[PDB]
């Protein structure tokens, strides 16, 4: 699993469940290309967007629809939604966490680029 | 002013100097069009970006150029940039601060919305 | 004013209003002495806690009184206080901005540190 | 495992590896008393603090070592250390997850509690 995503909420200290997510790839004529998509599970993951083969060097963005998530549980939200976009390098071997901690306000995301 | 930012640095422990930004506003075809730009000052701060008479409802998008400024600093960041998407003056006028504290692989965005 | 204090609502997106905390400063005996405290205002600020005299080099600790906050607006948080812990002013006198942003369940600070 | 703790680095965009922390409980006289310790494993996770019959209901600390961290590293830091400071509740099972996300002059924390 090279790409995995874990979002978590801190209005309720648990995790995000059920938040949809796009993941796009720029394209040779800068607009972007759906690539992956899914909603976390019960632990706020989700694997198996992409395997090895498939996950190339390129411009990846994290679309995590929160606007959705916030307003299923009757909480007015601020952002539309939350991106993250990011080069994917090959320097060793690398596996991607994209890890992100939603407010109705307010989102904060990390990296964990590992071994 | 109707729309303000603020950048720190969670790695100087400073306000975020010179960082580059490009605001859009989503127009009736779905496309992204420019909207305003500017750079952060010594403070950190942009101010200026448009008037309360330019500033109607609508959907918006920050984009922080964060690569740029962290490959000026000498670091190789992970994010392309931070964005920031919402829907602004829809209940009517409202004065938006975005602010965003910054690291080489996280970023942290809240706003204060006041009428 | 060498050390101010800013506080954030990331459930609200407003300034956190009346939070209060108090200062503490490390003694020669590691205990820590009461040194300042009050409340924020309507902009989430509070100043005015010391002076470049009094605030001399040492260990201090800026308790946050969040569980008090979050109460009150009808929620039962997480944390008991939020707390920053710092040494100031042992390279010659510096101005200090401790700012936090609140959730339930989670809760970010940082430091502006200028000459 | 009834509490668990997570650190992640926001500079190099991986898990905090070998850092310290200290686990205390609030006494009767107001006193923070050991209660358990250790250093995070290479994932940036430290499991087996306590056992389901000791973790009782009351006040905690959770001491995070971060200038130790950043010093290791050779990176200047601001705070002393984290802390972390919160009720256990019996409510019905639960499962404590203290997550940490360190910068130099910076720190985010969070809680995930589950069943
Ligand atoms: O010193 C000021 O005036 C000032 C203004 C806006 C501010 N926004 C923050 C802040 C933002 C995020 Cl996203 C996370 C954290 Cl921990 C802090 O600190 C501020 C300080
Ligand atoms: O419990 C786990 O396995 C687990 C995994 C990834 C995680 N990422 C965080 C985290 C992320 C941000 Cl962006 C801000 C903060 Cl404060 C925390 O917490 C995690 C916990």
């Given at each position: 699993?090279?790409?995995?995503?874990?979002?978590?909420?801190?209005?309720?200290?648990?995790?995000?469940?059920?938040?949809?997510?796009?993941?796009?790839?720029?394209?040779?004529?800068?607009?972007?290309?759906?690539?992956?998509?899914?909603?976390?599970?019960?632990?706020?993951?989700?694997?198996?967007?992409?395997?090895?083969?498939?996950?190339?060097?390129?411009?990846?963005?994290?679309?995590?629809?929160?606007?959705?998530?916030?307003?299923?549980?009757?909480?007015?939200?601020?952002?539309?939604?939350?991106?993250?976009?990011?080069?994917?390098?090959?320097?060793?071997?690398?596996?991607?966490?994209?890890?992100?901690?939603?407010?109705?306000?307010?989102?904060?995301t990390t990296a964990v680029?590992?071994?």
């Amino acid at each position: 699993c090279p790409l995995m995503v874990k979002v978590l909420d801190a209005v309720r200290g648990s995790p995000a469940i059920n938040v949809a997510m796009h993941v796009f790839r720029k394209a040779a004529d800068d607009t972007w290309e759906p690539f992956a998509s899914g909603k976390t599970s019960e632990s706020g993951e989700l694997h198996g967007l992409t395997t090895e083969e498939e996950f190339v060097e390129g411009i990846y963005k994290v679309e995590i629809d929160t606007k959705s998530y916030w307003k299923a549980l009757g909480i007015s939200p601020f952002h539309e939604h939350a991106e993250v976009v990011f080069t994917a390098n090959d320097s060793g071997p690398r596996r991607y966490t994209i890890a992100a901690l939603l407010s109705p306000y307010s989102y904060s995301t990390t990296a964990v680029v590992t071994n």
